[PDB]
Amino acid sequence: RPTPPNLEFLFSANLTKGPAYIYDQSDAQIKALQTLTGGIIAGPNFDGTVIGGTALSTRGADGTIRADAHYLIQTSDGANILVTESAAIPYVAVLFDTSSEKYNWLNNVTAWGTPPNLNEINFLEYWQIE
Amino acid sequence: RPTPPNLEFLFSANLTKGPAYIYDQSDAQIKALQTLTGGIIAGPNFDGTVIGGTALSTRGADGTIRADAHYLIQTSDGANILVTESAAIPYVAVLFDTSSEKYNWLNNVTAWGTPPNLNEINFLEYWQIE
Amino acid sequence: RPTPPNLEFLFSANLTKGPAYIYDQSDAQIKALQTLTGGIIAGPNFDGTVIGGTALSTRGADGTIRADAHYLIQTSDGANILVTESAAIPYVAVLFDTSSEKYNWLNNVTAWGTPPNLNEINFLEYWQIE
Amino acid sequence: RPTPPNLEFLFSANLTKGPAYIYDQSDAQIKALQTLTGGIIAGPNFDGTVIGGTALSTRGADGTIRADAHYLIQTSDGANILVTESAAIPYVAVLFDTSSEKYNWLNNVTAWGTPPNLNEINFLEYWQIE
């Protein structure tokens, strides 16, 4: 019997976004760019704010949405962390890059998040998977 | 208390790889390209073989390894599925693309895998996270 | 004797950027995220403004700078065009995505740009290469 | 009057490819993975062979083809160079990564290529643009 990975609560994000700018409209799919204008990061590991970032999404006529994003967290104690998201919406996979010694452990983390309330898509809870 | 996602066993991969070709060697990190020459896919959902694909890795002097890969599964019943991997080795995040009607549900899946035996890095077990 | 491609002036961009947020500082290289906060697009083909976008750069101790960016142009006549940049700074390669019928021809274009004045890195002139 | 960049002949590639594996077939577009199984590299700067690599393409019902590829050149004198291609077919933009001291200058190069004969799509001539 394969052994499943362990899940540990990592952080939450309460994001603010600009309007979705559709650049590729067709009967088959809509592709958009959306700015991440800010956000609150909370949790037992790091808290802080989202400085900025961009999301690219493709919304299929079939209801499938694939999104890729980068955004920059700045922690309360001044560390910069790049967040790399890849999603099969509403499921979001996450990688991290930082040279902060306090937060360096995130360079080895795969995380995963989803909005706990699918009526509030800009509030996500993320889990460390290992 | 945040609610964790559910984990369901998805597939295993027993991959074959060519040699790692280092193209960027420095004291700080090694970057390599590695061909995925084949592999066995097994599990309760799909079985088949790996047709081909490429992995790009960066191995830090700090022991962190980040890898990105694409490879193509062909199922026993003839479906082509693109696998998009992004890893903080040995933890691997996975997305899928197919137009197969039988396997279309994978377009909405985030999966996650790791070698159950870290002495055998080319055998991974993957889980659907949702 | 190989035949070189033809070069036609395509557009200029006068970009505004936020501060460079360094997330990965080491003796070997600096990696940063920078927001594209706006900009003027001009030329004989399209004019308009930059709505938004993000640049990721790595600046080597060796002086090499590699950058990738996405930003969204909105033309004077309301068309949305995604610009995908990949650079060996100060040389910038460009692709485009739009479903605008007026600007659809850009989906088939490879462009290339550089600041005419390397003291003014945020003003670039771009050329259609074919 | 904007000043155009200079074009210098860089290399040619005579590539071999495996079959195109379509993973996403629809009336709107076809997405495929294709293995680069080998190739001859020639020119005044470097000659050698293609070790391997993968191309991902999307072929629109509208005739537009967008492709992204990575492949590894090994020069006659043993240097490994990663080639990163992004194309609006048949126009191909190119970046390079190597730590070879002899070929390090390619890390600062944007190149561009196209098949001189569009009946022979696997033979391309590439130009340094700067």
From Swiss-Prot, chains A, B, C, D:
Pathways per UniProt: Secondary metabolite biosynthesis
GO MF, one annotated term: lyase activity
Species of the source: Penicillium herquei
Coiled coil: none
Domain of life: Eukaryota
Record's keyword terms, sorted: Glycoprotein, Lyase, Signal
Job of this protein: Hydroalkoxylation enzyme; part of the gene cluster that mediates the biosynthesis of phenalenones such as herqueinone, compounds that have been reported to treat tumors, bacterial infections and/or mycoses, and rheumatic diseases. The non-reducing polyketide synthase phnA synthesizes the heptaketide backbone and cyclizes it into the angular, hemiketal-containing naphtho-gamma-pyrone prephenalenone. The product template (PT) domain of phnA catalyzes only the C4-C9 aldol condensation, which is unprecedented among known PT domains.
Protein name listed in UniProt: Hydroalkoxylation enzyme phnH
Known partners and oligomeric status: Homotetramer.
Top enzyme category: lyase
This protein's domain notes: The extensive N-terminal loop participates in forming interface between the subunits of the homotetramer.
Record: glycosylation sites: N14, N108
Pfam families from the UniProt entry: DUF3237
Signal among keywords: yes
Reactions performed catalytically: 2,4,7,9-tetrahydroxy-6-methyl-8-(2-methylbut-3-en-2-yl)-1-oxo-1H-phenalen-3-ol = (2'R)-atrovenetin
